[PDB]
Design a protein around this nucleic acid. Sequence first.
RNA 1: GGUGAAAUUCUUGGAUUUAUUGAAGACUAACUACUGCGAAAGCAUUUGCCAAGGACGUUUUCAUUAAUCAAGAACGAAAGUUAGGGGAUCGAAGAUGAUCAGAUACCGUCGUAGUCUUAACCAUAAACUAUGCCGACUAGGGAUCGGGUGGUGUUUUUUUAAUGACCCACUCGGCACCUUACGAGAAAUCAAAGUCUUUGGGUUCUGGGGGGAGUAUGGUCGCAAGGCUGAAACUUAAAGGAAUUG
RNA 2: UUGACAUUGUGAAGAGACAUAGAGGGUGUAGAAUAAGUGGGAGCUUCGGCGCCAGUGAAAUACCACUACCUUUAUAGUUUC
RNA 3: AAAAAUGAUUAA
Lengths: 63, 97, 25, 214, 127
Amino acid sequence: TPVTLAKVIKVLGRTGSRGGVTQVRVEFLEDTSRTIVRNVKGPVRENDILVLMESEREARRLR
Amino acid sequence: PKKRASNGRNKKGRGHVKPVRCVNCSKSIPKDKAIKRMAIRNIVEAAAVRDLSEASVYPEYALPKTYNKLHYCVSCAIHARIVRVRSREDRKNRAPP
Amino acid sequence: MRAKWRKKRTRRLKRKRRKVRARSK
Amino acid sequence: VVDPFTRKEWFDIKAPSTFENRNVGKTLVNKSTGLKSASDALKGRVVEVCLADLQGSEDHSFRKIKLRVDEVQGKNLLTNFHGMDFTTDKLRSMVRKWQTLIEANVTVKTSDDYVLRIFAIAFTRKQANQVKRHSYAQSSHIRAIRKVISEILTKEVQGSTLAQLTSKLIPEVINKEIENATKDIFPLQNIHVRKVKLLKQPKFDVGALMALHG
Amino acid sequence: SQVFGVARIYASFNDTFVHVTDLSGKETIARVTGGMKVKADRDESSPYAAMLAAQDVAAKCKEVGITAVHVKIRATGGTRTKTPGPGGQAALRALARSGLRIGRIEDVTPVPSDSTRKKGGRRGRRL
RNA sequence: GGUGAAAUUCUUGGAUUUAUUGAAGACUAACUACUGCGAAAGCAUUUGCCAAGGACGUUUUCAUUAAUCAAGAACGAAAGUUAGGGGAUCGAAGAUGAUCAGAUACCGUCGUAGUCUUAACCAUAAACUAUGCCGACUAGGGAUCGGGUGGUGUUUUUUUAAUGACCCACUCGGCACCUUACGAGAAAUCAAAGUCUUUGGGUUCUGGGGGGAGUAUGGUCGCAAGGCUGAAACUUAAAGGAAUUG
RNA sequence: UUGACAUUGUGAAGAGACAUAGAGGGUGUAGAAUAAGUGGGAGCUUCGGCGCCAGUGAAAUACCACUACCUUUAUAGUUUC
RNA sequence: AAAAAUGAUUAA
Ligand SMILES: [K+]
Ligand SMILES: [Mg+2]
Ligand SMILES: [Mg+2]
Ligand SMILES: [Mg+2]
Ligand SMILES: [Mg+2]
Ligand SMILES: [Mg+2]
Ligand SMILES: [Mg+2]
Ligand SMILES: [Mg+2]
Ligand SMILES: [Mg+2]
Ligand SMILES: [Mg+2]
């Protein structure tokens, strides 16, 4: 199974209708030059590792 | 009363200009009154710049741009918050930024 | 009432007054 | 199960000799059979190729070229000049406000019966130490410029037929001569032929193509 | 040393067309649209549907010969919006991600010198 | 395909999407501006032809020939009317799918008339700068368009000549801006809406509380649609303007 | 009006039907392999390999199923568009 | 760019 392990390096902001989703920037563990912006449900610090079922989508709801 | 000296448009000396259509709603609006913006973008997003630069056969690619002139009716410019309604003294300011 | 629709309604009324006077003369 | 990509012959595309490297690309059609098969279905094909690809230089990134397949022999498609035009981004970048656009247009033919429409564009220029903001022309300069540009374009055509016309069109020398002619009326920024379209062509004349290929 | 085709990404609203052709464009190689990857019927123009279509073309781009592609991004054009749809960037990015090589990206939307009165009436589409 | 989302619709009798052509009618992007022309309505592809016009220059000519104008004329957006042509697109009516309590509305898909043109009508618009026209005077600036004048000015030619294009200083006319009103105004605001109880440069038109009513009648014009001219009875204490606070 | 025969002679290039046989699974979810069906039912083979059971589905899988269309294929020929 | 109609009379 291609599950992707990514480390957050930046929390972009708190998004969502009710503010329940986090905008974060994550680089990949296997190669740290593959940054991507994702949506995270629960609470996050920096230096936390996520798991990505599909590793190719960019997170909407910017600025 | 009268809200603006130049009523809502830019037409003093001719009487009729021509209509154009709003990009959003296709409403007819005089060209001098229509809100005009110049959308100049890099043809590829800043996210995909590194991706396509690595996937490009030609070293030192040009990275072309897209150019577009957008015409808005007053309702669609306000709704899409392009003009952003101002105050009585702020209405006179004609500077862009 | 909007003035132009008062105007339009009056124009239909004047049409109908013209036709009823046309029956007489 | 049909799998149409199991029956295609992988032909090559060859450009006229009036360029640098003759390689263009790769093309393919269908298998050959009875009932008037794809021997001639390969004829009417226009290949759009950038002139930077045909001339090995980045300064020809715009100015894309239309090539038309004329005669097929072996694993090669001989092509001939079919047209030329600018890329949309280059056009849009040239067209800016607070300047006048000058457009000329001529329908002329070469020494042979290659009738074709040459376009031309120019934009007025702010000269040095100009305090003024827009630099518009006076609409009589515009007509004078359009007159002399039309004269130059018909001068460059009707002599120096299509082979040498292309060989002059690539080095961007026609609009150079236009600049020398028009510099006494109103200074200009971007003088470009911007388009050539081919209107009518004569009998096929296999010999001219085989002269231009090989 | 690489075989060149044309991408011809027609990213409208309501849908995205990822339609690879040969250099001439007379024949086609793997025309897949965003609406046959999803069943949402309102996500046909989505970047996700465009990305799945752009991976499907790359799948058919291999084992058929094409290795590099020329990008012709297209909006609806004409009298309609002539701005690219949401899926155009995703389709191009997925093509770049899928190992297809990229050259000659150009915008080929149909732009008229004024013609053919626009739909919507004089007062517009009123919402 | 299309929408918040859908469904009417089309599609293995190949729709959508490609490429090469062809036809048709309409339109003239970007350039396009607090720019230009026109009495106004209006006017934006090239070139040719025809007549017209403002401004400027003038040590040319006439010598009051002028200003504004009841009656009377010409032109006059769009829609609309009659006849022929055209009939792509968009689309009053209509069909039809949604939404809805109902929707013969908005949204979607079609679509007759129209949209274009000729020959005739019509003569109305928030036809607006809601500011009549002519003339004089009163404030501080920057630009800009058209013409003309001047240069211990530059630019491409002869690397040292006009001219063209920029610069500076002016000047006449024009579209308009910015600051402040000294003045005016009920104020908003206004370089005219100033030079008005310190009330008079010339002249045309219009209004007299709100409704009834731009109605009735008569006349007149129009094929019609309708236009122009246009009351009274009756009814009523406000209707209205600008600005302040909520 | 439509078909056939006769009038009615001379010819070619793409299709397509008859008969023998070899092939063939084409999918969405998911057993344990990519499931085109319905009846029967736990065995021969150097492999205990497979089916029985228990999980899996709209439906069982070894085997007998030259059986049922459906989709292809090479014939000495014989027939039609 | 989903839908959202109504609110009896008088009383600084
Ligand atoms: K008020
Ligand atoms: Mg108001
Ligand atoms: Mg008007
Ligand atoms: Mg097709
Ligand atoms: Mg001009
Ligand atoms: Mg009136
Ligand atoms: Mg009035
Ligand atoms: Mg009034
Ligand atoms: Mg009264
Ligand atoms: Mg109440």
